[PDB]
Symmetry: C3
Subunit: 114 residues, 3 copies
């Protein structure tokens, strides 16, 4: 799984250990081993949500499976919870795009996961 | 809607008011309320288009619906027009990926839009 | 085609000529003319892969066609090879999301490719 957070919150506001917390929580939520979880946080971005430059986040979670209606609601409560607690972003100023990847469409280690 | 522009144009060349202009014009073009429009501009990027480092942009527009052949032509004329007028990027050095998101695959406000 | 690499490798570790090498090798691999290849390298990123912050990359390749099981394996060997040789990133710390775009869903030059 690959989780990307783009935010206007400044770099100094991202706590030490946030990448590790995201890695652990996403391993638990997806049921995938932490060795396969990649996380990427991009602070200090020029962005707006609803026309406002108040704190916001634009995110994606790509996974080979483990994507669906109920799972995505659970992921959204988890990840909005983390962004609210750790980055002080309101959940109604977060979008998360969920992408269910075919294994043949993910490259890794000189080949694909197919 | 979520609109992301990555460009090699420098930050100082992005005019004041640009995220607001994008927000307003995307609300009009997509028919979505402005409160649901998210915009993100990333200047100063290391990129090339056709092997050239002249000004260019790589963009995405994701929306729950309002994506299709005719709509996307209209969005492209709008957004290339804005990038030409405001960032001085030639329209033939812009790519925009349009993505039609299922409501169940967009997280927001601790849940999804399903 | 549009190729994006996000990496924690520092900007000074990206060798001169790398965007041109990516452009040339993706033209050859996809069979598309280099005038249509766009490339984007984002160094100095805050990321982790499998819980650690040794060099890693999170990438995407979007193309109108030329995406499939065998092609994607070939692209992965080529691109993991380039990232290992030029950025010293281990191939098992690279993810590449391959996206097959419909022509009507790619904006360019005030219209779409439809």
């Amino acid at each position: 799984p690959m989780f990307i957070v783009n935010t206007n919150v400044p770099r100094a506001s991202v706590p030490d250990g946030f990448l590790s917390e995201l890695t652990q929580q996403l391993a638990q939520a997806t049921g995938k081993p932490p060795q396969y979880i990649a996380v990427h946080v991009v602070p200090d971005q020029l962005m707006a949500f609803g026309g406002s430059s108040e704190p916001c986040a634009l995110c994606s979670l790509h996974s080979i499976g483990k994507i669906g209606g109920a799972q995505n609601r659970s992921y959204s409560k988890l990840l909005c919870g983390l962004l609210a607690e750790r980055l002080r972003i309101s959940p109604d100023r977060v979008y998360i795009n969920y992408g269910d990847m075919n294994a043949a469409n993910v490259g890794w280690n000189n080949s694909t996961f197919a």
